[model samples]
Target: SSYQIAVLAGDGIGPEVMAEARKVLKAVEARFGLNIEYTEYDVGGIAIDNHGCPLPEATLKGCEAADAILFGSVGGPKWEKLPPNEQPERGALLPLRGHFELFCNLRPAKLHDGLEHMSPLRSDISARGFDVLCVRELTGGIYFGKPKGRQGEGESEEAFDTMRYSRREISRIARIAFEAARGRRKKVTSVDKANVLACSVLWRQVVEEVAVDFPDVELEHIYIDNATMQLLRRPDEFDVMLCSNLFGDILSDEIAMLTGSMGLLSSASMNSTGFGLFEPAGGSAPDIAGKGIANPIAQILSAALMLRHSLKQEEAASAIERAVTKALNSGYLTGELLSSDQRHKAKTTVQMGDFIADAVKAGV
Candidate 1:
C-alpha cells in the first residue's frame, strides 16, 4: 500500500523530534513493504516568518491533498506577542481541525507497568495501573456555542457562554466511544452534568440511544463532578471515558499527568471520515530546541497513530509501538526518563530513535 502524509514540523523541538519520527517511519516502510511519501510544510512561527500566517494557504492545500497529517508541536515565547487567536498553537491546529471538521479526539493515556516511577501518583496508587482512552467530542459544546460574550454595564456587567449539543453531535461522538469500547474493555463511562446542565441532559439521553446499537458494550453514566474525583481515586476502573469538549479537555490533561511525561503521549483527531491529524500531546520546547535532550517518543508514536488510524496499517503501527516499548525496556533512557542518579547516562534524541528503528528492523 502507498500513502501521502503531510508533515508539519512546526518550530523549536518540533523539527528535532520530527526528524527522528521520519527515521522510524522509513524503517516501517522497509519492514512492511509499503510505499509512504511525506511532504513537508512550514507552520506556526516559522510560517508566520516565511509567509506571514501560521496556517499558510499552501500548507492547507497540502493537508487537504494528503491522506493524513503527521503534526509536530507548535508555538513558543517568540510568537507569544501575537494576538491570542493568531499565535502558533491556536492559529494553525485549530484552523486545520476546524477546516477538516475533525471533531473526534482520541487520546490514550496508559501508565506502563515498569514506568511507574514517571508518574506523579503515589507508588502504591500508580502500581494499580491504568490504561484509558478519552473519546472527546471536539467541535460542539461551550467552545463553539452561540450567544457567548460580555453584556450589561458598570457593576452589573457580566459575561455569558452557551453550552450546546445536538442529537446528531451527541449520537456521533457516543457511537465513536461505544465502537472504541468494543475493541477495548467493552465498557463506556459517559461523563456529563445532566442534573444541572440542559446540554448534558440531552447528551446523556442521546448517548443512551446510541448505546442500544452496541448491546455488547457496558454503559455507565456518572456526573461530571463525581467523575473527576473517581478518576483520581480509581483510574483503572475506566476503559473509554466519553465526554463533551469542555469536560474532555479537563479530563484528558488529568489522564496525561497519570503517565508522568507529556513527551510519551500522542493524540489523534478525526472527522466522520477516516482522515485524521496525529500529533504529540506535548508542546514544542523552545528552551530545549537544539539541545538534543528532548524526547522523540511522542512524535514517533504519533506516526504510529497516523498509520493505524489513517493508513489502515495496523501491523506496522503495532510494530512501532512494540519497538518503542522494547527500546524503553532495554534502557534507552532519555533525559526526562532517567532517574536523578542515572541522568548522566541518558541517551541522546537520535540514539533513542535509532534504538527503536533497529528494534523495528529486527522485530520479534
Candidate 2:
C-alpha cells in the first residue's frame, strides 16, 4: 500500500510529541510493508510568524494532496492577543478542519483499569469504568455559522453568532455516530437543545430519521444542559454521545478529563469521503514546551487511528494500539500520566515513545 500524510506540528509540545510518533510509524512501515510518505508543514504561532497566516497556502495544498493528516496541538499565550480569526488556535486548526470539510470528530475516552489513579472522578464512579466515545459535528453551528457579528459599538454592543444545520449534515454525522456505537455498546445519546433552539429541533429530527436505518443501534435524546450533568454523574452509562459542533466541542473536552489526562486521549475528524484529520485531545502546553515532560502517547495513538481509518492499515494500526497498551502496562510512565505517588520513575517524553516503538518492533 502507498499513501501520503500531511503532518502539522503546530506549536510548543506539538513538534516534541510528533517526533516520537515518527519512530513508531517507522515500525509500522517495516512490519506492514506500506510506503507512507510524510510532509511536515509549519502552522499555529510559528506559521503566523513566518508566513503571516496560520494555514499557509502551501500547507493547504499539501493536505489536499495527501490521503490523511496527522496534526498536533496549536495556540499559546503568545498568539492569544491576536484577533479571534488570527489567533493560532482559532486560525490554523479551525481553518484546516473547515477547509477540508472534516465534519465528524471522534474522541474516545476510556479509563484503563490499572490507570484508575490518574482519573479524578470519585472512586465508585471511576470503578464503574467508562469507555465513551464522543462523535462531534465539526463544520456547522456557531463555529462556522454565518450572519454573526456584533450589533452595536462598545458599551451598547450585542454579539451574536448564528447556529444552523442542514438535514443532510445532521444525518451524515448521525450515521457515523450510530455505526460507531454498533462496534461497542449499542447505544447512542443524541445531545441537542431541541426544546429551545430551532436549529437543534432540526438536528434531533434529522437524527431520528437517520436512526431508522441503524435498527441494531439504540438511540436516545438528551438536552445539551442535562447531558453535561449526566456526563459527570453517570459517565459509565454512555457509549457514543452524538452532539452538534458546539455541544460536541465542549462535551468531548469534558469526557477527555474522565480518562485522567489529555495525554491519553486521541481524536479523529473525517469527512464523508473517508479522508481524516487525527490529533491529540490536548492543546500545545507552551509552559512545558522544550521540557521533555509532555506526553507523546496521544500523538502516537492518533497515528494508529490515521492508519486504521484513513490508510486502511488495520493490522498495523492494531499493532500500534496494542504496543501502546503494552508500553503503558509495562510501566512506561510520562510526567503527564504519572500518578502523584510514582513521580520517581516517570519517563521523559522520548523514553515513553521509545518504549512503545520497541514494543511495536518486537512484535514484528
Most accurate candidate by lDDT = 1
Q: How many clashes (backbone N, Cα, C below 3 Å) per candidate?
A: 0, 0
Name the best candidate (by TM-score): 2
Q: By TM-score, how accurate is candidate 1? A: 0.96
- Candidate 1 residue-wise lDDT, 87-130, digit = tens: 99889977887789899999998987578888888888788999
Candidate 1 residue pairs in backbone clash: none
For model 2, the run of ten residues with the poorest summed lDDT? 333-342
Q: What global local distance difference test value does model 1 have?
A: 0.91
**lDDT per residue (tens digit) for residues 1-364 in model 2:** 4699999989999999999998899988998788999999888898999899888999989999999999998888888999888988888878888998999999988998688767889988888889999999999988899888888888999988898899988988998899999998999999999999998999999999999988999999999889889988999899999999989988888888877867988999998888999999998999999999998999999999999999889999999999988978888888667766778888999898888888888993
> How many steric clashes does model 2 contain?
0
